[PDB]
Amino acid sequence: VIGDFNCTNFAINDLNTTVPRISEYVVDVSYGLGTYYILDRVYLNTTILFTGYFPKSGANFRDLSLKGTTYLSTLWYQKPFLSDFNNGIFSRVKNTKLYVNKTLYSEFSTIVIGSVFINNSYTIVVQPHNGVLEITACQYTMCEYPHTICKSKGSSRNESWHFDKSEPLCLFKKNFTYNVSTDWLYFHFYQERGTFYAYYADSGMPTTFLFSLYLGTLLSHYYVLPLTCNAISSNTDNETLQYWVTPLSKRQYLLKFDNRGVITNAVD
Ligand SMILES: *[C@@H]1O[C@H](CO)[C@@H](O[C@@H]2O[C@H](CO)[C@@H](O[C@@H]3O[C@H](CO[C@H]4O[C@H](CO)[C@@H](O)[C@H](O)[C@@H]4O)[C@@H](O)[C@H](O[C@H]4O[C@H](CO)[C@@H](O)[C@H](O)[C@@H]4O)[C@@H]3O)[C@H](O)[C@H]2NC(C)=O)[C@H](O)[C@H]1NC(C)=O
Ligand SMILES: CC(=O)N[C@H]1[C@H]([C@H](O)[C@H](O)COC(C)=O)O[C@@](O[C@H](CO)[C@@H](O)[C@@H]2O[C@@](O)(C(=O)O)C[C@H](O)[C@H]2NC(C)=O)(C(=O)O)C[C@@H]1O
Ligand SMILES: *[C@@H]1O[C@H](CO)[C@@H](O[C@@H]2O[C@H](CO)[C@@H](O)[C@H](O)[C@H]2NC(C)=O)[C@H](O)[C@H]1NC(C)=O
Ligand SMILES: *[C@@H]1O[C@H](CO)[C@@H](O)[C@H](O)[C@H]1NC(C)=O
Ligand SMILES: *[C@@H]1O[C@H](CO)[C@@H](O)[C@H](O)[C@H]1NC(C)=O
Ligand SMILES: *[C@@H]1O[C@H](CO)[C@@H](O)[C@H](O)[C@H]1NC(C)=O
Ligand SMILES: *[C@@H]1O[C@H](CO)[C@@H](O)[C@H](O)[C@H]1NC(C)=O
Ligand SMILES: *[C@@H]1O[C@H](CO)[C@@H](O)[C@H](O)[C@H]1NC(C)=O
Ligand SMILES: *[C@@H]1O[C@H](CO)[C@@H](O)[C@H](O)[C@H]1NC(C)=O
C-alpha cells in the first residue's frame, strides 16, 4: 500500500499482471540530454566541471507507468513499483497524445515522492492537467491504492489518490506550462542536505529548474500512480503510457555552454 487511508474497495484484486519493462534506450548525455541547467545561473561561452546528481551514462530505465481499466492490483502498490528514492531519479516521460474530436489532449502518469506517505509527512506530487503541470508538496492523506484518470477520454473509476476534505498544509504549490504537442518530457528529482530539487524539460534538451524546497527530513520512497481510462490500450487505440525512470548519483560532469548560454555538450 502507499498511504494507509481506505479511500475505496471498488474492483481491487491481487493479479500479477506485469513487471516494470527495461528500456532498450539508454542514457546518452553527449548533447546535454540527462543534464540540467544549474539553478537560476547563466553560464556563457565556457566549459565547467560541475558535481551534481546525474544519471550514469549508458544506464537503462524502468518503465513504471501502470494503465488500468476498472480493476487495480494490490501488487501494483508494492516493490518493484514502490521504489526507494535514494539520491534521486532522472525520468523520461511519454506525453500520451489523445484526440476526443479533432482536438488534442495530453495525458501522462503522476509521480509521488515521499517517505511514509501519511499526513504527518510531506509528499511531493507532480501531475499533468493537459498542458499545465501541477506540482505540490503537502501533508496529503494518501490512499492505500492511489490512482489518476483520463480527463480526456472516460474513466470507469473516479480520481482518488488522497482524501483531504479541506486543503492540507503545503510547503510548495505551483503550476508550470508544457508544450502539449511534444512526444517527451524529462525530469530530474533529487535531494541534497535535506533540500529537494526538481527540474523539467518538454524537449530532448537539458532540464530547466522547476523549484527547490527545504524539507530537513529525507525523502525515501517514490511511486508512479496508476492511471485508468476507457482508452490507451491495444483493443481501442494502440496508444500507451510510458514513464521511464533511472537512478541518480553524486557525479561529476563536464558541461559545455555556447555564447547564448545553451548546454551544447556534456561528459560523464
Ligand atoms: C490523517 O491520516 C490518518 C491516517 O489515515 C487519518 O486517520 C484515519 O481517519 C479515518 C476516517 O475517520 C479513520 O477511519 C474510521 O475509524 C473508525 C474507528 O475504527 C475502529 O472501529 C471499526 C468499527 O467501527 C473497526 O472496524 C476498526 O478496525 C477500528 O477498530 C470507524 O468507526 C470508522 O467507520 C466508518 O468508515 C468505515 C469505512 O468506510 C465504514 O465501514 C463504517 O460503516 C463507518 O462509516 C472509520 O473506519 C481511521 O481509523 C483513522 N486512522 C488513524 C490511525 O487515526 C486522519 O483522519 C487524517 N487527518 C486529517 C487531518 O486528514
Ligand atoms: C498495469 C497493467 O497490467 N495494465 C494493462 C491492463 C491490466 O492488465 C488489466 O486492466 C487487468 O488489471 C487488473 C488489475 O486486473 O490491461 C489493459 O488491457 C486490457 C486487457 O488486459 C484491455 O484490453 C481491457 O480489456 C477488458 O477485457 C478488461 O476489462 O480488462 C475490457 C476493457 O474495456 C479493456 N480496456 C480498455 C479498452 O481500455 C487495460 O487497458 O486495462 C492494458 C494495460 O496495459
Ligand atoms: C494549477 O492547475 C490546476 C489544474 O488546472 C488548477 O486547479 C483548478 O482550480 C480551480 C479553482 O477555482 C478549480 O475550479 C478547478 O476545478 C481545478 N481543476 C482541477 C482539475 O483540479 C489550479 O487552480 C492551478 N493553480 C494553482 C496555484 O494550483
Ligand atoms: C474499506 O471501506 C469500505 C467502504 O466503507 C468497506 O466496505 C471495507 O470493508 C473497508 N476495508 C478495510 C480493509 O477497511
Ligand atoms: C510476477 O510475474 C513475473 C513474470 O512471470 C515474475 O518475474 C514475478 O516473480 C511474479 N511475481 C511477483 C510478485 O512479481
Ligand atoms: C568564446 O570563447 C573563445 C575561447 O576563449 C573565444 O575565442 C571567442 O572569441 C569567445 N566568443 C565570445 C562571443 O565570447
Ligand atoms: C464516482 O463519483 C460519482 C459522483 O459522486 C458517484 O456516483 C460514483 O458512485 C463514484 N464511484 C464510481 C466507481 O464511479
Ligand atoms: C511544440 O512541440 C512540437 C513537437 O515537438 C513542435 O513541433 C513545436 O514547434 C513546439 N512548439 C512550441 C511552442 O514549443
Ligand atoms: C493495434 O495494432 C495491431 C498491429 O498493427 C493491429 O493488428 C490491431 O488491429 C490494432 N488495433 C487497433 C484498435 O488499432
From Swiss-Prot:
Residues bearing attached sugar chains per UniProt: 6, 16, 45, 101, 119, 158, 175, 179, 238
Disulfide bond entries: 7-143, 138-170, 150-229
Domain BetaCoV S1-NTD residue range list: 1-268
Protein function: Attaches the virion to the cell membrane by interacting with host receptor, initiating the infection.
Protein name (Swiss-Prot/TrEMBL): Spike protein S1
Gene: S
Full-protein residues shown: 14 to 281 of 1356
